[PDB]
């Protein structure tokens, strides 16, 4: 908060703030919105690895950056609907990040 | 599809759909001919460790974050050309992703 003052350092640090909780809220809400889906989608494949739907979507959140992949062999004959889903959402979470961007 | 509506939080969310799905359908499509020619490549070398070419194609599409570098010590003395192809295809898909933002 004490940033407020100081020098022209807080020129570009005042103004993030009217335009970031504005747009950060929406997107986040829609990549949870998705996230949560994709959860409860793993959870679906791996019934009958993605035991609870906490654990689904704390493996989701790693897929953007440090992932959970390489399914375990036979998933009951459901590895390349799996598989898919995957990139799915990878690609989901791209294209929101470069929405985020523009 | 509902944010169409609500308020200015959509004036951004309907513009991307008609310059997103022209421009990332035809990068990706050049990404995934890369990928699959990079995965036929890796089979290639470690026929005589990226056994299917489905196998590669998953290696290759982790390779971009998350790896599966290291090779397996002594591969056939062909390890210094397979960890050149696979630098090569950190390249193409760095400047498809700089291409990809401008």
Same mark, same amino acid.
């Given at each position: =908060? &004490? $940033?407020? %003052?100081?020098?022209? $350092?807080?020129? =570009? ?5 009217? !335009?970031?909780? +504005?747009?950060?809220?929406? #997107?986040?809400?829609? &990549?949870?919105?998705?996230?949560? %889906? ?5 959870? @679906?494949? @791996? +019934?009958?690895? *993605? ?5 689904? @979507?704390?493996?989701?959140?790693? #897929? $953007? ?6 399914? #375990? /062999?036979? /998933?009951?004959?459901? +590895?390349? !609907? ?6 799915? *959402?990878?690609?989901? $979470? *791209? ?8």
């Amino acid at each position: =908060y &004490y $940033t407020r %003052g100081f020098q022209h $350092t807080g020129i =570009y640090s005042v103004m993030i703030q009217k !335009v970031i909780l +504005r747009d950060l809220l929406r #997107f986040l809400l829609v &990549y949870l919105v998705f996230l949560f %889906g994709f959860a409860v989608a793993l959870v @679906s494949l @791996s +019934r009958e690895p *993605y035991r609870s739907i906490l654990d689904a @979507s704390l493996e989701l959140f790693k #897929f $953007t950056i440090g992932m959970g992949e390489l399914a #375990f /062999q036979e /998933q009951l004959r459901f +590895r390349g !609907v799996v598989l898919l889903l995957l990139l799915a *959402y990878v690609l989901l $979470t *791209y294209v929101l990040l470069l929405n985020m961007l523009i």
